[PDB]
């Protein structure tokens, strides 16, 4: 078939930087090419089309172009709200073949993420589990690590940790960590605590609970 | 002027038919247009299924070609896919899109597993979830199958400060994941929060309130 390659397939820049996505096809497409960006909750957007039409409302910041079989999507003067995936689209025959996609970060200031912590809910513990929940607050980068201690001991393979995509306003993540425990477990030990270590964290961040307690 | 949106059943078994429709307002199938399906599978990536023109031609992507047929109904202006001897791998969100909108995209998993709905159990904003004015609570919603459900807070009248995370499947094969929303520490007393979770597959709906530790 006629195959996109799609270059590179992550980026990472700074509000205002210029960034250059390429997609080379495998044969002559003429310049029957589309440009399309996945936001995270929204409907996929075409940008761009026959390479370098831009859609009526995309900013011009974005910028298609092509050389022979080479095709660039061009973001200059990057905004927060461009964190999306980015992908090419052939149109020049049958069928239609996407390239891989680009994501793309939205790099910003160092931020520390700010931590919270859930006990187990009444309701859950009439079940045989018990779930805890440590919340990590808009933080940046991305990167954290979330370690479990229960009565002091260090957890391990019991809990699951989820990010959200990044804001598209102040382009911060955040973070859920659950520990999941038996109820026999949980009524046996006394101190539940995550530790929290980030970038942005001169020291690790304890947020802990005492069960049972009223 | 045109709208797309897609329906089907979310869950398929394996070695069925899946069948998913796009139902377009505000301009005729028939009219101009290439009508399109494409699907995105768990991996990200994204694949064109075929076409249907205006005229009623069609096209399948060489690689479903034996196991395909896009119909229409132009007395409804619907479009439609059938997939056929499907299997796991066929578990994607399948959109419907003309050359420039696309549909939201439904979601369709393949397997032999029946639906489950979500408990939904609070996550109750405390001392420990509070700083500087400024309070964290959220809902716990656990142990459902398939993919997706949606959470709204109190009825879709909260948005601002709502973060309802990917979902993660649990080593028990069903999905969980939590929502969590900050909301001024001073109206913990005083406003109700409740958070709304649909699970379409199981024809499942749970309100559940979260309230302050009483403790
Ligand atoms: C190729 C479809 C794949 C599915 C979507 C996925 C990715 C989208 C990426 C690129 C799309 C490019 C579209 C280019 C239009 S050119 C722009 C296009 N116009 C037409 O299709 C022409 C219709 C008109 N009635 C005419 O024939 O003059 C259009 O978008 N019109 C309405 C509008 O602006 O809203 C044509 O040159 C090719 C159409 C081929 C087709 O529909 O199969
Ligand atoms: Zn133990
Ligand atoms: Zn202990
Ligand atoms: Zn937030």
């Known amino acids: 078939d006629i195959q996109m390659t799609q270059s590179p397939s992550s980026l990472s820049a700074s509000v205002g930087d210029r960034v250059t996505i390429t997609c080379r096809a495998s044969?002559?497409?003429?310049?029957?090419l589309g440009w399309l960006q996945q936001k995270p909750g929204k409907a996929i957007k075409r940008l761009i089309y026959?390479?370098?039409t831009l859609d009526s409302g995309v900013p011009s910041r974005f910028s298609g172009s092509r050389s022979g079989t080479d095709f660039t999507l061009t973001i200059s003067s990057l905004q927060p709200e461009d964190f999306a995936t980015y992908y090419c689209?052939?149109?020049?025959?049958?069928?239609?073949?996407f390239g891989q996609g680009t994501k793309l970060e939205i790099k910003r200031t160092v931020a520390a993420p700010s931590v919270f912590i859930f006990p187990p809910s009444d309701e859950q513990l009439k079940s045989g589990t018990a779930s805890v929940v440590c919340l990590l607050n808009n933080f940046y980068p991305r990167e954290a690590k979330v370690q479990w201690k229960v009565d002091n001991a260090l957890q391990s393979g019991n809990s699951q940790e989820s990010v959200t995509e990044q804001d598209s306003k102040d382009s911060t993540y955040s973070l859920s960590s659950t520990l999941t425990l038996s109820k026999a477990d949980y009524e046996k030990h006394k101190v539940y605590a995550c530790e929290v270590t980030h970038q942005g964290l001169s020291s690790p961040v304890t947020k802990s609970f005492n069960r049972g307690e009223c | 002027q045109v709208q797309l949106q897609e329906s089907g059943p979310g869950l398929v078994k394996p070695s069925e038919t899946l069948s998913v429709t796009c139902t377009v307002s505000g301009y005729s199938i028939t009219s101009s247009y290439s009508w399109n399906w494409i699907r995105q599978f768990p991996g990200k990536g994204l694949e064109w299924i075929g076409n249907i023109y205006y005229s009623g031609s069609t096209n399948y992507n060489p690689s479903l070609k034996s196991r395909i047929s896009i119909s229409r109904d132009t007395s409804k202006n619907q479009f439609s896919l059938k997939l056929s001897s499907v299997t796991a791998a066929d578990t994607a969100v399948y959109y419907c899109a003309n050359p420039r909108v696309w549909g939201q995209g439904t979601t369709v998993t393949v397997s032999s597993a029946s639906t489950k709905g979500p408990s939904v159990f609070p996550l109750a904003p405390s001392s420990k979830s509070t700083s500087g004015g400024t309070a964290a609570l959220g809902c716990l919603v656990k142990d459902y199958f398939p993919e997706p459900v949606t959470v709204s807070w109190n009825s879709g009248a909260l948005t601002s400060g709502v973060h309802t995370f990917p979902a993660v499947l649990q080593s028990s094969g069903l999905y969980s994941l939590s929502s969590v929303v900050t909301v001024p520490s001073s109206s913990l007393g005083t406003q109700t929060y409740i958070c709304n979770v649909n699970h379409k597959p199981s024809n499942t709906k749970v309100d559940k309130r979260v309230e302050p530790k009483s403790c």
């Open positions: 689209l052939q149109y020049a025959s049958f069928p239609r073949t």
């Open positions: 026959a390479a370098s």
């Open positions: 044969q002559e497409i003429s310049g029957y």
